[PDB]
Amino acid sequence: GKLPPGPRPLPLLGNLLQMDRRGLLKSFLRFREKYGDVFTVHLGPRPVVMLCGVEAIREALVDKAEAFSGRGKIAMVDPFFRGYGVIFANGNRWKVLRRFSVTTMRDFGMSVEERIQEEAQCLIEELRKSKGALMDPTFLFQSITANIICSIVFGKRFHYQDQEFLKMLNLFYQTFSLISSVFGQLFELFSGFLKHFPGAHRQVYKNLQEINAYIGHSVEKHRETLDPSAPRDLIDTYLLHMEKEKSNAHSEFSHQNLNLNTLSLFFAGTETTSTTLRYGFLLMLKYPHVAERVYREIEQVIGPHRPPELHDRAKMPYTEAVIYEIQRFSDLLPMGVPHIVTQHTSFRGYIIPKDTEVFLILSTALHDPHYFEKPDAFNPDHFLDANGALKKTEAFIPFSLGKRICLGEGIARAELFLFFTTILQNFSMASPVAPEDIDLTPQECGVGKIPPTYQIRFLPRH
Ligand code: HEM
Numbered sequence: 001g002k003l004p005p006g007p008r009p010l011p012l013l014g015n016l017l018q019m020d021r022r023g024l025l026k027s028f029l030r031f032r033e034k035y036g037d038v039f040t041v042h043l044g045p046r047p048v049v050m051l052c053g054v055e056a057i058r059e060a061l062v063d064k065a066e067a068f069s070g071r072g073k074i075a076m077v078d079p080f081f082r083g084y085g086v087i088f089a090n091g092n093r094w095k096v097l098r099r100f101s102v103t104t105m106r107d108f109g110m111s112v113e114e115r116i117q118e119e120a121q122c123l124i125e126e127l128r129k130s131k132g133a134l135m136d137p138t139f140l141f142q143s144i145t146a147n148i149i150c151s152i153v154f155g156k157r158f159h160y161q162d163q164e165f166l167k168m169l170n171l172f173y174q175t176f177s178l179i180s181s182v183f184g185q186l187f188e189l190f191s192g193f194l195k196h197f198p199g200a201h202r203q204v205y206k207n208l209q210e211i212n213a214y215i216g217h218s219v220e221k222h223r224e225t226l227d228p229s230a231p232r233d234l235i236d237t238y239l240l241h242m243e244k245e246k247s248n249a250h251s252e253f254s255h256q257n258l259n260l261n262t263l264s265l266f267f268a269g270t271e272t273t274s275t276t277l278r279y280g281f282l283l284m285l286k287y288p289h290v291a292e293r294v295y296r297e298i299e300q301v302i303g304p305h306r307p308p309e310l311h312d313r314a315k316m317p318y319t320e321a322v323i324y325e326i327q328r329f330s331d332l333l334p335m336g337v338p339h340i341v342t343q344h345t346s347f348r349g350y351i352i353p354k355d356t357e358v359f360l361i362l363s364t365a366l367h368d369p370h371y372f373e374k375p376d377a378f379n380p381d382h383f384l385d386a387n388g389a390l391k392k393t394e395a396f397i398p399f400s401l402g403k404r405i406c407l408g409e410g411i412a413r414a415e416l417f418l419f420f421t422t423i424l425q426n427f428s429m430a431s432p433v434a435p436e437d438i439d440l441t442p443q444e445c446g447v448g449k450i451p452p453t454y455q456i457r458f459l460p461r462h
């Protein structure tokens with residue numbers, strides 16, 4: 001008849017002494033063994049409600065969408081955002097910024113396909129330049145996803161050796177890792193205390209600021225050469241809305257929202273898609289039978305000549321199930337992004353007060369044994385029926401659900417399929433490390449799950 005059951009906390013340190021050393025997710029998976037799918041965990045001084053498994057996640061985010069559609073904070077970035085931009089906004093602010101984003105993301109968007117195709121070719125082009133040398137694919141996979149989002153937002157794409165562009169992508173990488181670091185998870189619990197001392201949070205804050213100053217300077221240029229009848233990109237469109245509303249008593253179209261909303265899209269748009277790729281090719285190195293089986297489907301469906309295209313999808317159910325599996329296994333946001341309830345809410349006989357944070361442990365759905373047979377292993381069959389046809393599932397929710405559902409899943413999936421197939425079409429992969437010696441153990445597991453560094457060669461097939 002009250003907030004969900006869970007480990008009895010202490011004053012000051014909530015459930016610190018019951019956490020697991022390996023981090024927040026490990027801790028939660030245990031607490032689940034004992035407490036069930038719905039439970040409270042005091043992270044520092046606050047009863048954060050965890051929801052696990054597809055039933056429960058779906059029941060909150062969908063059936064109770066209103067109650068569960070609010071946004072929590074990520075302690076490590078909150079000092080910078082403080083509720084601005086679409087990702088971290090609530091109430092009307094979010095409403096406006098979500099609508100704005102979704103509409104202008106499509107407008108130049110869902111041509112988007114043409115831009116991914118073009119970028120995919122600049123990409124092949126660069127991988128030829130490497131001449132099969134060993135390389136860390138990190139910056140490139142970042143470049144390509146970033147360029148898609150940049151073209152939509154700044155109206156252009158960046159050269160792969162643009163120093164100032166590489167500087168931006170370095171900041172995203174570091175930042176996401178600092179966030180996901182163990183000090184990151186620790187900061188989630190004790191930022192009240194830890195904020196007053198040195199540590200990664202200050203690096204993150206500084207980084208976000210740098211990125212934001214670039215965005216801000218770019219906004220200034222857009223303003224100087226703005227043509228009210230020929231809006232170039234998302235920033236221009238924003239600037240016009242800003243003008244339209246400048247007499248409205250409260251516009252959410254403020255400079256803070258412009259800069260941070262842009263940053264949110266720019267960053268979000270870059271990080272996960274590229275990471276999925278990174279973790280995807282490490283999986284190809286570890287399982288070449290899957291890689292060449294994907295090639296043999298590229299063979300039949302596209303041949304080795306024609307740029308692949310979104311239409312090819314339906315005809316390539318294996319490649320598609322391979323991608324779904326890469327996503328599932330990668331599990332890139334094991335805990336999604338934090339929610340809050342917007343009212344005093346009933347859930348399974350429990351009561352969650354207004355404004356009680358809620359974590360939807362997406363990872364528990366992507367690993368649910370009722371839906372996947374060896375949840376811990378990389379196996380495309382998980383997305384295939386007996387006939388080798390595509391088998392989508394209720395539990396594949398790496399984008400979350402509901403009103404906060406990833407507003408980029410559409411473009412993320414285009415990018416994923418396009419970039420993936422266009423690479424495999426042209427290249428084969430090898431590394432020094434023998435397949436079964438390849439370690440899939442992530443180098444960070446916090447807010448994000450981050451794959452180890454690896455070296456890779458792309459050998460031509462001509
Ligand atoms: C496979 C890659 C991606 C994954 C797995 C992913 C996943 C997610 C998740 C888990 C959330 C919030 C979850 C929740 O609170 O329920 C989210 C929201 C969001 N994503 Fe992504 N995302 C991906 C790619 C992208 C891309 C390409 C963009 C392009 C802009 C993007 C932009 C955003 C934004 C702006 C939000 C905020 C949604 C809101 O607050 O209404 N993401 N995504």
Ligand SMILES: OC[C@H]1O[C@H](O[C@H]2[C@H](O)[C@@H](O)[C@H](OCCCCCC3CCCCC3)O[C@@H]2CO)[C@H](O)[C@@H](O)[C@@H]1O
Pocket residue numbers: 193196197198
């Ligand atoms: O020139 C900058 C340098 O100044 C910095 O130190 C600050 C740290 O950054 C700063 O974090 C530390 O602050 C002392 C924290 C004391 C707050 C006590 C809190 C306890 C919890 C309850 C609220 C209060 O002061 C340090 C020394 O003044 C540090 O000397 C160097 O860290 C840094 O070289």
